[PDB]
Design a protein around this nucleic acid. Structure first.
Ligand SMILES: Nc1ccn([C@@H]2O[C@H](COP(=O)(O)CP(=O)(O)OP(=O)(O)O)[C@@H](O)[C@H]2O)c(=O)n1
Ligand SMILES: [Mn+2]
Length: 347
DNA sequence: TCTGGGGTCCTAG
DNA sequence: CTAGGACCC
């Protein structure tokens, strides 16, 4: 018996969804962003089709930037209702396969297949591609390995519309020259710190003395990085309801903000908006965090724990309005954010 | 071609 | 008990 982990990632997801209802736009540059107006400032690309990516457009890029880089791209507004519906369909469809299925956000899922040892993980991956293509119209890629992090890395190589197998057999030969941030979990900061320790590749980190890392990163993070560099990872595909820990709404305003009357009303509204949504989900708030960001793009957040789990609107808005009070100035605030942390204990 | 929004987790003081 | 650093989709 061979335990496989398959990572299923829908290609160009938001674009592909748009493509189902604009099938004339296939093989053309399509950019999905804040409101379909590229001229609109303070807005960014949410998803760039593969054709738009050939001109350098990528998620995070301001839409003005991307229209300069790709003037013939069709810009479409974000339509979250249509993406929730596309997502639940394809997943709902992948539950119908009878393997354990772990869903990660919207596009992506992990599938646990224990295969007799007669069978072919490549074989299962194509079916998933064929059924997904045939029933939803969307295209997916599948990375295959024996643990979640390495399967995800395999998806990187499987894209677009493909399948890639990444195991102990080929991990180090495929990945050993890559910089540490190619690993899932590792970003530019860690890379930079590892660079300052003489570790500039996956292969270097894999043979790095445990002590160096556990002194530098903590006795659990240090060993985890070593695990990751050797291609290790989580191996259990948990098929259970994901329970959110928090919900949050931030907003960067069309105009910079200076007078506090606006600032208070925004954090009040964010607080209430957030709280109704979690009241709908049968959740209780534990702590209220407020975020401010200046014209600098400075950015700092503050949290306060409620005296007791609560759902009380007045007590929560006041806490949010009280935490906003601590932030120093009444500058040009670019962005205001409220996150509610939720109880994790019972229902 | 001035910089989005929703998340999780872990470790310092 | 919190600050925020770091990564992720
Ligand atoms: N910064 C980000 C990164 C991602 N997302 C959202 O997450 C989905 C997939 O992430 P993803 O990272 O797998 C990309 P996908 O669009 O499927 O392209 P691919 O086929 O080559 O992977 C996207 O369609 C975005 O709306 C976002 O809002 N902000
Ligand atoms: Mn994805």
């Amino acid at each position: 018996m061979t335990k496989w982990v398959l990572h299923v990632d829908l290609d160009q997801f938001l674009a592909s969804v748009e493509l189902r209802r604009r099938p004339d736009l296939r093989g053309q540059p399509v950019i999905v962003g804040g409101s379909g107006d590229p001229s609109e400032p303070r807005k960014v690309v949410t998803c760039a089709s593969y054709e738009a990516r050939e001109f350098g457009v990528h998620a995070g890029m301001p839409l003005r930037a991307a229209a300069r880089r790709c003037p013939d791209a069709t810009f479409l507004p974000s339509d979250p209702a249509a993406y929730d519906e596309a997502s639940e369909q394809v997943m709902g469809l992948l539950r119908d396969l009878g393997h354990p299925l772990e869903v990660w956000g919207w596009d992506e899922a992990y599938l646990g297949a224990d295969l007799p040892d007669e069978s072919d993980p490549v074989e299962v991956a194509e079916r998933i591609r064929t059924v997904v293509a045939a029933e939803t119209g969307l295209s997916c890629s599948v990375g295959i390995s024996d643990n979640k992090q390495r399967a995800k890395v395999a998806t990187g190589f499987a894209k677009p519309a493909g399948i890639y197998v990444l195991t102990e057999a080929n991990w180090m030969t495929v990945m050993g020259d890559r910089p540490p941030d190619a690993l899932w979990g590792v970003g530019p900061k860690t890379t930079k710190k590892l660079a300052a320790m003489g570790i500039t590749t996956v292969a270097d980190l894999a043979v790095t003395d445990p002590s160096v890392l556990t002194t530098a990163f903590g006795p659990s993070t240090g060993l985890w990085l070593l695990l990751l560099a050797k291609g290790g990872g989580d191996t259990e595909v948990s098929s259970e309801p994901w329970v959110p820990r928090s919900r949050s709404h931030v907003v960067t305003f069309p105009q910079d903000l200076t007078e506090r009357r606006e600032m208070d009303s925004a954090v009040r509204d964010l607080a209430l908006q957030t709280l109704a949504e979690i009241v709908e989900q049968g959740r209780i708030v534990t702590r209220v965090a407020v975020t401010v960001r200046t014209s600098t793009f400075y950015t700092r957040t503050k949290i306060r724990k409620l005296p007791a789990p609560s759902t009380d609107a007045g007590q929560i808005v006041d806490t949010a309005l009280a935490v906003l009070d601590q932030f120093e100035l009444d500058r040009p605030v670019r962005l205001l954010g409220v996150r509610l942390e939720l109880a994790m204990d019972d229902v």
